[PDB]
A paper describes a structure:
The protein arranges in a canonical homodimer that contains four calcium ions, one in each EF-hand, and two zinc ions at the interface between the two monomers. Although zinc can replace calcium in the EF-hand motifs when present alone, only Ca2+ was found in all EF-hands of our model as judged from the anomalous difference Fourier maps. The two symmetrical Zn-sites are formed by two residues from each monomer: from the first monomer, His17 in helix H1 and His27 in the first EF-hand, and from the second monomer, His83 and His87 at the C-terminus of helix H4. His27 appears however somewhat flexible and in two out of the eight molecules present in the asymmetric unit of our structure, it is flipped away from the Zn-site by around 45°, the missing coordination being instead provided by a chloride ion. In any case, the Zn-binding mode of hS100A8 is very similar to that of the four other S100 proteins for which crystal structures in the presence of zinc have been reported, namely S100A7, S100A12, S100A15, and S100B, with the particularity that S100A8 is the sole among these S100 proteins to display an all-histidine zinc binding site. Our structural data therefore clearly confirm that hS100A8 belongs to the His-Zn group of S100 proteins. The Zn2+/Ca2+-hS100A8 homodimer we observe is highly similar to the previously reported Ca2+-hS100A8 homodimer with an r.m.s.d. on Cα atoms of 0.65 and 0.45 Å between the Ca2+-loaded homodimer and the Zn2+/Ca2+-bound homodimers from crystal forms 1 and 2, respectively. In crystal form 1, helix H4 is not involved in crystal packing. The movement observed for helix H4 in both crystal forms is therefore more likely due to the presence of the Zn sites rather than to a different crystal packing as compared to Ca2+-hS100A8.
Author numbering:
A (entry chain D), B (entry chain A): 1 to 89
Write the structure that this text describes.
């Protein structure tokens, strides 16, 4: 990671691995793991949607866990909301 | 204090604005602007695809520019690709 964009994606990968390496499959963020991720990494306006609501949305293949590709849904939705709020009067 | 995940998204937003503030509509990355972004922010396996190939692919509504939502398509594909490459070699 040499550029700002590459470092940012590398940080996103490290954030995901910080919760997927807790237990179970190394590429699975479970419902309780996601709850800690939301409470630790995300702002209140993302956090207050609830871990259960987010998990239903993120678990695309309905295997009971959130993989990295599914995790990008939360990442992108956080990016849209943060950028939207940055210009919002 | 801002979390690692929040900083990463702010950096992504900063990257986009770095090129959308160049000229014209300040929420628009034009063809040459996107080429500068790809040539500066992105690795080789992204760049080799071609700047014009990326533009045609990212400019979904064919309005002549890449807005923020369209730019996130590149971020997603780069995120998946970077994660896959981080588990190589
Ligand atoms: Ca796990
Ligand atoms: Ca899943
Ligand atoms: Ca512009
Ligand atoms: Ca467009
Ligand atoms: Zn903006
Ligand atoms: Zn991984």
């Amino acid at each position: 990671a040499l550029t700002e964009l590459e470092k940012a994606l590398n940080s996103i990968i490290d954030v995901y691995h910080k919760y997927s390496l807790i237990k179970g499959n190394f590429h699975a963020v479970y419902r309780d793991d996601l709850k800690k991720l939301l409470e630790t990494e995300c702002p209140q306006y993302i956090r207050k949607k609830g871990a259960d609501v987010w998990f239903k949305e993120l678990d695309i293949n309905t295997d009971g866990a959130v993989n990295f590709q599914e995790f990008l849904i939360l990442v992108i939705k956080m990016g849209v909301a943060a950028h939207k709020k940055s210009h919002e009067e």
